[PDB]
Every structure is written in structure tokens, then in C-alpha cells.
Design a protein around this ligand. Sequence first.
Ligand code: CU
Ligand code: CU
Ligand code: CU
Ligand code: CU
Ligand code: CU
Ligand code: CU
Ligand code: CU
Ligand code: CU
Lengths: 128, 128, 128, 128
Amino acid sequence: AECSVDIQGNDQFQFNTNAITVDKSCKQFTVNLSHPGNLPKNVMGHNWVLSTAADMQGVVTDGMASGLDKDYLKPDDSRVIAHTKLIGSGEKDSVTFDVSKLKEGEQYMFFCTFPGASALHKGTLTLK
Amino acid sequence: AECSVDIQGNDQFQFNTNAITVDKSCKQFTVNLSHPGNLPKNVMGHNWVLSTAADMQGVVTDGMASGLDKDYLKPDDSRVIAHTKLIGSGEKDSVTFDVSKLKEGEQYMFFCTFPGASALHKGTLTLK
Amino acid sequence: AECSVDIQGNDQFQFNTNAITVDKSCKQFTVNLSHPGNLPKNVMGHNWVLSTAADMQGVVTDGMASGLDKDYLKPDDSRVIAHTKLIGSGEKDSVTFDVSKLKEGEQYMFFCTFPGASALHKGTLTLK
Amino acid sequence: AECSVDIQGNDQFQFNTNAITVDKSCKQFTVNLSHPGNLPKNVMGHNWVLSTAADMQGVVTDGMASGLDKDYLKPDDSRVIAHTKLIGSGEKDSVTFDVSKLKEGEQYMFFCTFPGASALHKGTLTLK
Ligand SMILES: [Cu+2]
Ligand SMILES: [Cu+2]
Ligand SMILES: [Cu+2]
Ligand SMILES: [Cu+2]
Ligand SMILES: [Cu+2]
Ligand SMILES: [Cu+2]
Ligand SMILES: [Cu+2]
Ligand SMILES: [Cu+2]
């Protein structure tokens, strides 16, 4: 199977996908995030953050509060299964995590914690 | 004789059968439940749940209140003879139970405890 | 004095308050219920229902027994001073009632009659 | 508010959008569908069909079975809230429908019922 996915954040609080599938024969999974927009990190920051569907809103709430100096992530946040850093115009970043950190049947959400994203700057991640 | 049945729930709150017969020579019996629908488990979850006719309403009622994190079954409900887990679009689960649990000629109902089901989201099971 | 209040029900069995004040100089009082969550009313319904603290338990117990097709309220329940309809995600409802129906020294509770509430899906209303 | 949207179906079983919002003050709403592609209708037809999320699979399935002569829609399908006709390369079709057919608390999908298109040949439509 394939074990990585390419994801674009644009200038309008948007990923170019809202659903990721992780094949369970994969040992590791890799998310390749890039920012094809023109806006700096401070006005249009994007990160890819992975948590349980239950933990999502708590990670985002505390994240937005942490501010830009913390990459919009409450420090030591145990709920974050994996995450890229925050990136702005031009930049890119890749995160790799162990598929054994996941479970079949459990609901996971990927999302961005930069402030201003609607309740739509998110998507599902599924172990199949 | 056969001691298994394949059963499907889809996006219109429907099992694709209303009657199961279990041959008395069976020692175990297996139900293979699948969800060919498009809707995820939290808006159109399906399970397959077995009880006496008398106990059905109470199982369905208490399951309602238990919520999605309990798979819409009240914990430690002794009236549930056997059941699958709750599944959503594209998922599958199988349950196998001992036919010693079922008494000849008695009235057994199978049903789904996810909310929003019609009173007819049910069916009979019987030892033949 | 203000004579209205806005209240939100979310995807986790919760109002965004448990304390309503109705000033005695109000001729009418208005509750604006909105559902910012994402689940339909069949798995995450919210209503705002008002009775005496005395009547609460009986309105709730009978309402869940009345099922989704009755908005989880017993028909012709005289214990209900005022109520919204049951709403799900993306829905809103408003209810306005005469403040006269309220008398000083009486305790009033507002509550939701949907199954699932962790006995904290309630709150006080008092004539100040 | 504007009360129309322009949508293109290409030579790749692909719409050029996945989300449509209909302003609630719109009395009618128009979808202007065009096929800027090269492939003819019987190998790459496109339509725009609207239903509840729940009804979608049945509309797609029953329409598949109905064939090209019927525009890949089962005749007299009451689950179809509105639709264009099937169009091929160089064609265009517009459909105008009553917004009162929509309700604020419902999840609507739009999609194409021509065969071969993936589970991605779809989109959400929401009242706003
Ligand atoms: Cu592989
Ligand atoms: Cu972002
Ligand atoms: Cu046998
Ligand atoms: Cu079901
Ligand atoms: Cu006043
Ligand atoms: Cu509620
Ligand atoms: Cu207008
Ligand atoms: Cu198409």
C-alpha cells in the first residue's frame, strides 16, 4: 500500500482535502504539508494536527489561545497524536508517525489550529 | 445445516431481513453485519441486537440514553442475549453466540438500538 | 432591564449556561435556542423546557417515554409553562412567554428532555 | 444575496466544486451546469442531482439501473429535490427550484448519477 499523503493549505483557511485514509499494512504514515499561498505565517498560518475526534475541540481551543509564539499549540498537549509545525507562504513541512498509534474503528480528525478557521478546516483520518 | 446469516443495514434505517431461523442442530450461530451505506456511524450507525420480545423495549430505551460512546447499549445489560458492535458506512462486524442461550419455540427479536429507527427496524429469530 | 437570553446546545448534551435571570419588570421574556453542533436532532436533539422545579422530573420522565416523534414531550403536558421545539444542528428556535406566569418565591427549572443528558442538562430560572 | 451558482463537469468524472450555500432569502435558486469537456454524453455524461444525504445512495443506485435513456434517474423519483438533465461535451443546462423545498436542519448532497465516477463526484449543499 501507499503510506503518505500530500496536503496543501491555501490563502483562505483551507486544506485541499477533507478525508485521509491510512492503510493498516503501513508501518509509518507521512503527511507532506505545503503552503502554496502568498500570506505570511502570522496572517495565514497552517499546520496539520492529528487527534481523536473526541479530543479535537479541546486541542484547538487551547491551541488558538497559546498564540503564535507557541505555534498555536498548548505545550506538552498529550492529546496530539502527531503534528507538523506551523508554516506560512512558500514553506513546507512533513510529519511521520507510527501507524501502531492508531486503532481501527476509532474516529480521528486532522485539523489546523490557526485562529479564524471555520469548523470546516478539518477532516477525517481513518485506519482501514 | 447452516449456522450463519449475512445481514446488511443501509442509509434508510433498514435491515435487509425481518426473519432469521436458527437450526436446532447448531451449537453456535454467527451473524455477519455490514453497512453498505454512505453515512458514518454517528449519523447512521447500525448494530444487531438480540433479546426476548418482552425485553426489547427496555433494551432499546436504555440503549438510547446510553449514547454513542456506549454503542447505544446500557452497560452490563443482562437482557441482551448477543449483539454486534455499532458500525458505520463501509464497516463490518460479526457476532457468534451459543445456541444453548436460545430456548426452543420462544419469541426472540433482533433490532437496532441506534436512534431514529422506525418501530419496524426489527425482526424475529427462532429455533427451527 | 433586558428581557431575553440566547442559549446554545452543542454536540455533547450541554447548554452553554445553567443560570437564567428574568427581571420582574419584564412583561415578556424570550429564549433564543441555537444548535452550533454538527449532529442531527435524532442523535443530539436539544429543547428548552420550563416548569417548576417540582414538576421537572415528571416532565422529563414522561417526555423521553413519548419518543422522538413527539419532540420528547408528553402531549398536552400541563406542567410545561413554555418550551422550544426540539432542534438539531443548524437549527434555531425562539420561545416568548408572559413573565406573569412566574410568581416570586417559586422555583423554576429549565431543562432538556432528550435522552442522554447527564443530569446536568438543566438549570435554574428565578424571578428577580 | 445572489441566488445562483455556475458549475462545470469535466472529462474526469469531476465537478469543479464540492460545496454550495444557498442564502435563505433566496426564493428560487439556479444551478448553471456546463460541460467544457470533449467526451460525449454516453461515455462522460454529467448531471447535477440534489437529495438528502440519506437518499443519495438509493438515487445513485436506482438511477444506474435505469440507464442512459432515462438520464440515469429512476422515473418519478420523489427523492430527487431538483436536477439538471444529463449533458455531454459542449452542452449546458440550468435548473431553478423552490428554496422552500429546503429546510434549515437537513444535510443535502449534490452529485452526478452517471456511472464510473468515484465516491468523490459529490458535494454538500447548505442553507445559509
Ligand atoms: Cu505498502
Ligand atoms: Cu490552516
Ligand atoms: Cu449444520
Ligand atoms: Cu440500525
Ligand atoms: Cu427592561
Ligand atoms: Cu439538549
Ligand atoms: Cu438577493
Ligand atoms: Cu458527472
